[PDB]
Amino acid sequence: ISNVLEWIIYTTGIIFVLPLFVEIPAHLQWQCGAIAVYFYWMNFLLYLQRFENCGIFIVMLEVILKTLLRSTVVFI
Amino acid sequence: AHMMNLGSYCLGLIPMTILVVNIKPGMAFNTTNSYLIKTCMILVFLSSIFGYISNVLEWIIYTTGIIFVLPLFVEIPAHLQWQCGAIAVYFYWMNFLLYLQRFENCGIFIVMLEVILKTLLRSTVVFIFLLLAFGLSFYILLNLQDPFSSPLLSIIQTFSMMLGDINYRESFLEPYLRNELAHPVLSFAQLVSFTIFVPIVLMNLLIGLAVGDIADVQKHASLKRIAMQVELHTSLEKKLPLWFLRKVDQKSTIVYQEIPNADKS
Amino acid sequence: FLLLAFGLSFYILLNLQDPFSSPLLSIIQTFSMMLGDINYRESFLEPYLRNELAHPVLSFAQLVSFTIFVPIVLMNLLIGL
């Protein structure tokens, strides 16, 4: 749900910008930057869940995706 | 009357086809058949000014038509003119669909398409943040490789990726065996996540909206159509002068796949 | 009439490139393009890096519009019927 997203996003943001305050490998930092961006935005969708125009769209998408995961265990 | 309006638009439509089918793409503006072209050209220039959602379409189409044929009355760059010709053609025809919105055979089809497309645009703002996010993630993981250089290429590429083909599974594999692509461990994960979130689920949901609303329109389709014809005749009746009434009117008629039973209250 | 319109637009933007020479090839090509594969995203990209293809600015727009109006929405509506 939303709170492990709130966890992961911040920690990856931190790795993303530490090397101003230490020396660290450079590629690694750049690497986990990718994850930071991606999770960042997709998380941001759930904030856009609220309002009127979107507000119906996303609940639809979350529910359909949970419906997807039972299927994903059996075709996994 | 109706056809007459179409025709005013029609003697515009067949021109475009003739000019761009007959000659040619490239030439600054080219050699016989010279009359076919002169006639159609002047006819178009005149077909443009007559009148001057649907009205910004009525704006854009005419102005682009004008750029399309000015260089007979000035010197201008040639490629530019040819370029905005493309837009002119495309918008031209798609606009023409809305005139075909009227009548019976089509008359239901298109309202369906416009409504479904508006239903599409809320979705397009929210995956214009989502697909954008994916766009950038793929931007970062493989822009050693070409094409992924620069943001814009990446996002447009992923956009194309939505459709169907992945596609360009000749773009992970070969790097990976090359060992060119950095971050195998993560990147494969990225693609499996990607297919869990756009090729399959998003598409299916969009399909879901499609089916829901189209089903809803067809549920009481007949009224939408007949309300189209009555509306048109009432808003034709009011403008035309009273003395041109009965005639035409028989107020009688000699007599010498229609509408579905299943819908009911 | 609609797919014909698209056919001609792609006719004008990339008929330096082959196949788009002549109307008939173009319209049939776009027709095939409806199905699914774009497909032939090996037909914009490489020109563009070549810098062969004229009108990048507009043309990319043309393809994004195109995918908004046939691969996704039209197909889904036909599915709807």
From Swiss-Prot, chain C:
Changing residue 31 to A/T: Loss of inhibition by A-967079, AP-18, and ASD. Increase in activation by cinnamaldehyde, AITC and acrolein. Residues 24-44 dip into the membrane without crossing it. Changing residue 66 to A: Loss of inhibition by A-967079, AP-18, and ASD. Weak or no change in activation by cinnamaldehyde, AITC and acrolein. It is found in: Cell membrane. Residues 15-23, 45-55 are extracellular. The record marks 37 as: Crucial for calcium permeation. The chain crosses the membrane at residues 56-81. TRPA1 activation by electrophiles occurs though covalent modification of specific cysteine residues in the N-terminal cytoplasmic domain. Changing residue 37 to A: Abolishes zinc influx. Abolishes activation by extracellular but not by intracellular zinc. Homotetramer. Interacts with TMEM100. Interacts with EGLN1. Interacts with the scorpion wasabi receptor toxin at the same site that electrophiles but in a non-covalent manner. C-terminal helices from the four subunits associate to form atypical coiled coil structure; this region is probably involved in binding the inositol polyphosphates that are required for optimal channel activity (in vitro). The ANK repeat domain consists of a convex stem structure formed by five ANK repeats and 11 additional ANK repeats that form a crescent-shaped structure that surrounds the protein core. Belongs to the transient receptor (TC 1.A.4) family. Ligand-activated Ca(2+)-permeable, nonselective cation channel involved in pain detection and possibly also in cold perception, oxygen concentration perception, cough, itch, and inner ear function. Has a relatively high Ca(2+) selectivity, with a preference for divalent over monovalent cations (Ca(2+) > Ba(2+) > Mg(2+) > NH4(+) > Li(+) > K(+)), the influx of cation into the cytoplasm leads to membrane depolarization. Has a central role in the pain response to endogenous inflammatory mediators, such as bradykinin and to a diverse array of irritants. It is linked to Episodic pain syndrome, familial, 1: An autosomal dominant neurologic disorder characterized by onset in infancy of episodic debilitating upper body pain triggered by fasting, cold, and physical stress. The period of intense pain is accompanied by breathing difficulties, tachycardia, sweating, generalized pallor, peribuccal cyanosis, and stiffness of the abdominal wall. Affected individuals do not manifest altered pain sensitivity outside the episodes. This is Transient receptor potential cation channel subfamily A member 1. It comes from Homo sapiens. The gene is TRPA1. The chain holds residues 879 to 959 of 1119 of the full protein.
